[PDB]
Design a protein around this ligand. Structure first.
Ligand SMILES: Nc1ncnc2[nH]cnc12
Ligand SMILES: [Zn+2]
Length: 313
């Protein structure tokens, strides 16, 4: 563990909103004078039991209510940056979901100010490089994403890419091909969630329609050998999230996770925490789970950490 924790790493698949610890949630609620549905932290924490992606999302979006001020968004991000320092994550390319906040009335500029301020501290005080990624909510319309991209244009230099998260199944990457096209035209790189719950086909779409630089999750690629051969051949990175897949029931157990299989086959996989406050672990805890449940070796530990460095944008 401490050896794992000592490894230099880059986290490339993380949602800032998904780092919202129960304690922070209650503290922001207090500061913002919000009456929570949850009686206590302990009760909110017991609600972290999931049977699929959707059950998690509903709760995950519910939590975002307490994010109201610039200081809120600073606290959220700074708390995570501190975890990174402690776990020797030296480089972060985090997601945020503008629509979750803008749709609640919070100004786009306020969200960004808070996050940007923290990232600046992360780098000058903690030594942590960052590449903010703006993620679209895929259950909403492409039109809504276009409106979000328009807000992002004056800010475009604050983002290294646009991503795509939220309810995967029944919202294929194709639904968002136009806005992605425009984003790239405007100088954005692209990434996308694909093959978490969605089929291999969605991953082909991300690759070929959205033209992503990396696949987020991408575990269901395992079902598709032609795709596997392509991943291995193009060295397209996968941002795999062990505890997230476990907690969302992608795998019925951690002993059944295929990330080490992929590693050995030559897929350029990485280790990430995804939504650490909800899945009960940060990046080091994800490496640890691999060692515990899949007898991962230091050997494979070093390779995974290195892929994450190599896969930076
Ligand atoms: N892993 C994930 N998949 C889909 N939507 C998400 N929103 C936050 N994390 C997510
Ligand atoms: Zn994710």
């Amino acid at each position: 563990y401490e050896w794992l924790n000592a490894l230099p790493k880059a986290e490339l698949h993380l949602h800032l909103e998904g780092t919202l610890e129960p304690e922070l949630l209650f503290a922001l609620a207090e500061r913002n004078r919000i009456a929570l549905p949850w009686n206590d932290v302990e009760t909110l924490r017991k609600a972290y039991a999931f049977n699929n992606l959707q059950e998690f999302l509903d709760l995950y979006y519910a939590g975002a209510d307490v994010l109201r001020t610039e200081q809120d968004f600073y606290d959220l991000t700074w708390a995570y940056l501190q975890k990174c320092k402690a776990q020797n994550v030296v480089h972060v390319e985090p997601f945020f979901d503008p629509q979750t906040h803008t749709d609640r009335g919070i100004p786009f500029e306020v969200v960004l100010a808070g996050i940007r301020a923290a990232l600046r501290d992360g780098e000058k005080l903690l030594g942590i490089r960052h590449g903010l990624i703006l993620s679209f909510l895929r259950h909403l319309s492409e039109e809504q994403a276009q409106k979000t991209l328009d807000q992002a244009l004056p800010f475009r230099d604050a983002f290294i890419a646009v991503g795509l998260d939220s309810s995967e199944v029944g919202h294929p990457p194709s639904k968002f091909q136009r806005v992605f096209d425009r984003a790239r035209s405007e100088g954005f790189l692209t990434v996308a969630h694909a093959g978490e719950e969605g089929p291999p086909e969605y991953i082909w779409e991300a690759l070929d329609l959205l033209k992503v630089e990396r696949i987020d999750h991408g575990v269901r690629a395992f079902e598709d050998e032609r795709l596997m051969r392509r991943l291995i051949d193009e060295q397209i990175p996968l941002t795999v999230c062990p505890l997230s897949n476990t907690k969302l029931c992608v795998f019925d157990d951690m002993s059944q996770h295929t990330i080490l299989d992929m590693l050995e086959r030559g897929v350029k996989v990485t280790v990430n925490s995804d939504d650490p406050a909800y899945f009960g672990g940060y990046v080091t805890e994800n490496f640890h789970a691999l060692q515990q449940s899949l007898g991962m070796t230091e050997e494979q530990a070093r390779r995974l950490a290195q892929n994450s460095l190599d896969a930076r944008l």
